[PDB]
Ligand binder design. Structure first.
Ligand code: A1JB0
Ligand code: A1JB0
Ligand code: FBP
Ligand code: FBP
Ligand code: FBP
Ligand code: FBP
Ligand code: OXL
Ligand code: OXL
Ligand code: OXL
Ligand code: OXL
Ligand code: K
Ligand code: K
Ligand code: MG
Ligand code: MG
Ligand code: MG
Ligand code: MG
Lengths: 424, 425, 423, 429
């Protein structure tokens, strides 16, 4: 078939990484959906409702609100505009794309503990329902603990992504990652605190440790910087985006390219285009083998089902792995093994649907329908919802094979079943 | 969690290199898993007593070979009846019943091309008596397997044909023979006479490797515990040979003379069982599994896709077993190809499939006798519980263990597609 | 203490994932920078005093873009480069050779060699350029045309084919076979093929070049923001580091040094990043794969090359000193990407300049006249390498070095490898 | 290459050796791929009534005996001295043509401590006998700890400091205290007979494979010892299990294989030697060198010793060109031993003036000793070149080398042992 010369499949079947590089083809068109999420910073150039709709079409998955600048009234208005542009597509539930809201804090700024503004800003996040928090200048575990105690009673569900932007944060990394929900390689400040020529070492090390831990990792600053004023990026910029994906980053960020630049939609489209190409060029054979050898033995059925499903997906070239999820944990565990198959996550939790964008290859679907009396009937309708959406979005075709990860009883934490299905 | 697990060579199995694996092999690391390599015992004067056969089934005989090179049709029918009587004496407790296959080893073409007249009569005898396997002697080409298949007729279409490679031509035309055969037997006796004796190990290791790749059973035959015909204990070379046949990747090991005419037939079965358990625990699963997958091509067959997914899931949690419901034994055979450390408990209603799956390494067959339940999903769950209960009774499973359960979406063979992680209660 | 620096904990990891996890920002690179820097000479860099501070920063090859400028302008640039290079020839133990590369304008609309290109190639032969960056090579017949235009005298000039269009990428294997090396001309490539596909072309071409043992250059917009700003972007420092990690022998500045406000700063920056990236190379997998892909050879030079590289890894050799006439012996050692330096002691001034195209090869130009006793002349050249290495900080007393030599004079007779202790 | 001929790449299991996986390697094993290289695993033959005849010993040396074992459990000192004299007489009968002379080591296998701790009185007398008679190796029976090896070393005295001590592991304690024994011993013998009595018979293969692996890592010789071709005591042909056992001992990584009873008292002693030689050649060609070498390197620690550094460099160079042999000049045999540790397919040819080193290097797999008799040249470099040419001439005469082949020459920068540091690529003229 033509199939075995599309998503860099000749290069993916190579026996060595050197042979894999030699088999990379510019004419091998990526077919799979773009898995690395795009975080776009919302500013003057992008807070228009009609502009936000354009950005969602372009591939924006997470909207970032930089709390360094702007008032609470400004940020609440930006949030409302994002939600209005997101809900304008809720008329066709088979094509609706959830979009997460992330609050990027100001920072401690030469002081002990959480700054007074950060305490006020985190309460604002709780009161406005932010899905993610990018905690600025995390240096130790206590910093993470402070950002989490700040999310008061009503906000323990918000995902804290610790921003590493100084030498101390890099040295105390393992202790930070243990208590954080993910990490952001905040390259701008990092490139000021540590020598500029050492930042790539910090990026590659942190991405690798995050991949091992199964926790999301974000590449953040100056990725397409020249696109603030120019319609096209530099050769170094497209290389940087592609290399962040190849390193193993779950998310790529635009901050200024979308916040204040002349080409915000073009920067999103560009990051989408590069990410698709870079994801097809990932050497899955070594990546999966190493992921397995490093990942410890688990007696958790969710984790055991995850490798079994990822292995099964590789064996048959599964178009997608469709997993039902309440908290997103099942989808996150599948994501850790970096399958070439899309992780279609079907969920009834609008928050979980937005928060799974932090995990690479997870494509969230929000199930809006009324429940069936028979739980088994309800599970099959949600599985069919993922198939119907996948078909519509081009992820699946009739005749394809899919892996369907489900649980034996309702409620989260009981995933234990994996099925091989033929799309009808 | 589950403290003090220095047993079943787990430190050696977790090594990063094969050299490190060898260095971590421990004589004090006792094997805990059930013996996976089947034992073929040739039935003769020293072993056709019904009470002796009962002793050999307890010792671990899985397949009864009948050497049609000696004995009359009357003698072999009586041997078969004695075997079946000793096998069925344990059918009163179905949770502990062990199926035993009956294989017919032909005399051979001797000095003449094609099937000999006696072989055609002997193959008809096998069909009439209901043998499960046929060890076709002196297979040299694919047309020889076709001749044996034709002699079995229409009724003998379910009988498994294991081609015996015992000459130079059979070794050179191996790939064409394996394609049309159900499995291979490395008939080392005649092979050691046709080709130089110092070259037989190359033929054995090559054929076992190609069989492992193909997913078809391979038998290591002849003189494995030869000194046990007259002595109660084998030589150092003999125990090494049995252990090395298992390490090579052989699905089955054989006794022919040690059990047929010797003074210690039950002791030879017990010895082969003891060595096989030790050798199976010393298999370097890390490289074996990785190489098996890199060589196995991509598959759009749900049975084959579910097989790796289940084997990978079993390795991840150190699953005590992989319980699979099978009609023809194919689902269990596909799991077996990936050589999991977990036991492939294969529950089946087919008494022939139950006997024939002994040719596949690591497949512990169970014969489910109960008639079908009205609700299909309830019948499946009862068969799964039958595997758990048999598994518990036989010491394979304990409460708290994790098992992988391979099932299908509808009745009939060929629809295996589901894998589940269960906790033993 | 030794085991902590030059990313040695990360280099000893058993997996690439474990290698990434062991990368340390406090593990300072100790080795000399192996990836050569090609700096484009323009208005911002043709001053003799500026060229001297560009050689100190780490410029190894001076590029002359024949798209702009007259023959008189380029001859003056050449003279200024040679004047700045020869100003350091007073101390031969510290003298750094600098290659001169001519970048052709290109065929443009023309199917074969353009008239200007034939004139420019003759100019290069007459002026003694070491390298030629042939623009827009699409097939093997294009390389042949450039080779013919160089004539009989230009047979020693290295031809680096620039791949800058779709056809050049598809016909890559036939071009690499007839070329001395390849340049991933990212600028035009990013215009001919989609910008999001250029990294695939770069990584593929670098990989195939590493396998072939032929030099490969990463060329456009590496530190672009340094034309107007004193510091590069996070994407730019990442791009340079990733070009080195991909396996590129040379990194280029074209505009950052040619017309930008910070030409010396761009050279210093590329040097700083390359040292960090070279120490973070996963040598265990790189060497193992290089060996498994490299075919068996009955050539004693090639056989001695792996033997020496393997021996250098075994003892953590500070450097490998090789005596070369044409640079081929040093090039073959370079193919195996050793962590140890490749000190190439040559009497050929052209070979000394041209070996900058090979990663990890540090050229020393021996000038002294030949000794009466052949074995004594060899030992004096070996001692010349040791003395330059000690002076430049590559070697210390107590270190172990691998010494690659031959059994007789003349090129092509390399067959000996020795383990020496620095005294 | 390709221009060495198809017949070259379809022999010595070269298609199977070039496979990318061990499974692919097994699938490419060919019975018609004839071994061409010389047999590298040494054969230790036990000398008894069936083999102490001078003419019989000559037949066994031709068949492939490398080390003669003297079992001190049976026989008197007078009997063993006579056996030694007959061995030396049969060995020296071939010394007329030094380019084809094969050195043969003499090994003393002690009786053992039996039912008592420490060295038995007879063992002290027997060890003194060995020193007085000039034995090259001692197989110390029932070694259980490092202090046992020290006792045997002390009993050999000052003169017996050059005698190699191979500790026999034949009980549970010896297996558990293996690492401390191997550290103080020159090598190990997997004494399977007693081991199969002390530990369960079904566990002996685990002990064998573990000890061989640890010895390969340490670079110290390892011997597989009991019942290898047992049926050949009475029968002219061995069983399928026996030929498999010998082949598997070689594939495990054993430097030496032993005959004890098959050669000592059996009806077919020369036939058992010929059989062990035939199997070893086939098994050596079927060794998967790619994984073996890669793993050996990853486990071997970094070394600042030039002899060790030159050893990998030479072994790697030999694999790259399919070098016919690796000629090394050695005084103590250490240089050849270090090359042997990396298990090259290229036959290591060791040129030495020490007759004891020539005999003792049989303990190292792949080492083919040549005893150089010529007196020293005035010019040191000329003496080295003459010894290198002696290796080439013996190599050509014995069929190891042909004109056109590539060889690797490992030499040193000065006389005296411990100065190996040079590796050269030579073309055979
Ligand atoms: O040893 S290499 O440096 C190399 C080897 C030979 C060459 O010729 C060469 O040019 C480079 N190396 C590159 C990356 N791959 S990879 O398969 O793409 C990969 C595997 C594993 C990774 N983990 C697991 C989670 C991060 C990777 N993260 O980024 N990439 C990863 C492995 C081999
Ligand atoms: O390279 S070896 O010959 C070797 C030999 C001696 C050493 O001291 C050493 O360090 C390496 N070595 C043999 C054993 N395997 S193995 O792990 O046991 C294995 C893996 C894979 C196999 N497939 C996949 C299906 C058959 C094997 N089939 O039989 N065994 C198999 C590893 C490779
Ligand atoms: O019917 P529900 O409550 O949505 O659950 C369907 C199945 O998916 C799961 O909820 C997965 O949830 P989580 O990923 O959040 O752990 C299983 O526990 C459950 O059996
Ligand atoms: O035995 P039933 O009741 O027909 O149930 C079908 C079950 O067995 C299977 O038939 C497996 O059979 P095969 O392995 O012989 O193909 C599956 O479809 C399912 O697990
Ligand atoms: O690298 P090249 O061009 O093959 O030259 C290698 C040569 O180097 C030498 O060491 C130098 O010898 P000369 O300086 O006399 O040419 C020769 O022995 C060997 O042939
Ligand atoms: O293997 P050994 O005993 O350490 O020595 C290797 C020998 O090789 C040599 O080249 C030959 O020297 P000799 O003439 O003293 O034997 C020396 O470097 C060294 O004595
Ligand atoms: O916030 C950021 O992205 C930073 O500091 O680089
Ligand atoms: O059955 C046979 O002939 C054998 O095993 O050699
Ligand atoms: O010519 C070049 O180098 C380019 O276009 O990048
Ligand atoms: O002496 C021996 O060989 C033994 O005991 O095994
Ligand atoms: K901020
Ligand atoms: K140009
Ligand atoms: Mg910041
Ligand atoms: Mg037969
Ligand atoms: Mg151009
Ligand atoms: Mg003993």
């Amino acid at each position: 078939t033509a199939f075995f010369q599309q998503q860099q499949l000749p290069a993916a079947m190579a026996d060595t990484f050197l042979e894999h590089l030699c088999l990379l083809d510019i004419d091998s068109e990526p077919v799979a959906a773009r898995s690395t999420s795009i975080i776009a910073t919302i500013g003057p150039a992008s807070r228009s409702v009609e502009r936000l709709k354009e950005m969602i079409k372009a591939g924006m998955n997470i909207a970032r609100l930089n709390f360094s600048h702007g008032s609470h009234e400004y940020h609440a208005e930006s949030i409302a505009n994002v939600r209005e542009a997101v809900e304008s597509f809720a008329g066709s539930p088979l094509s609706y794309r959830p979009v997460a809201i992330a609050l990027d804090t100001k920072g401690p700024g030469s002081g002990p503990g959480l700054s007074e503004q950060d305490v006020r800003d985190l309460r604002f996040g709780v009161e406005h329902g932010v899905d993610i928090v990018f905690a600025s200048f995390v240096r130790k575990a206590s910093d993470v603990a402070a950002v989490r105690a700040a999310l008061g009673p009503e906000g323990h569900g918000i995902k804290i992504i610790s921003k590493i932007e100084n030498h101390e944060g890099v040295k105390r990394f393992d202790e930070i990652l243990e208590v954080s929900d993910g990490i952001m390689v905040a390259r701008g400040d990092l490139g000021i605190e540590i020598p500029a020529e050492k930042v790539f070492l910090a990026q590659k090390m942190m991405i690798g440790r995050c991949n091992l831990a199964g926790k999301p990792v974000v590449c953040a600053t100056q990725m397409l910087e020249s696109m603030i004023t120019k319609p096209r990026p530099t050769r170094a910029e497209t290389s940087d985006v592609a290399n962040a994906v190849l390193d193993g980053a779950d998310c790529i960020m635009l901050s200024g390219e979308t916040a204040k630049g002349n080409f915000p939609v073009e920067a999103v489209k560009m990051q989408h285009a590069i990410a698709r190409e870079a994801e097809a060029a990932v050497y899955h054979r070594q990546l999966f083998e190493e992921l397995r050898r490093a990942a410890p033995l688990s007696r958790d059925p969710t984790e055991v089902t995850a490798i079994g499903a990822v292995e099964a997906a590789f064996k048959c070239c599964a178009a997608a792995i469709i997993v039902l999820t309440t908290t997103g944990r099942s989808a996150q565990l599948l994501s850790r093994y970096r399958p070439r198959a899309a992780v279609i996550a079907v969920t009834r939790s609008a928050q979980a649907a937005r928060q799974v964008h932090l995990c690479r290859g997870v494509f969230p679907l929000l199930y809006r329908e009324p429940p069936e009396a028979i739980w088994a009937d309800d599970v099959d309708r949600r599985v069919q919802f993922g198939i119907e959406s996948g078909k519509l979005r081009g992820f699946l075709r009739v005749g394809d094979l899919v892996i369907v990860v489900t649980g034996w009883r309702p409620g989260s934490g009981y995933t234990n079943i994996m099925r091989v299905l033929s799309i009808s």
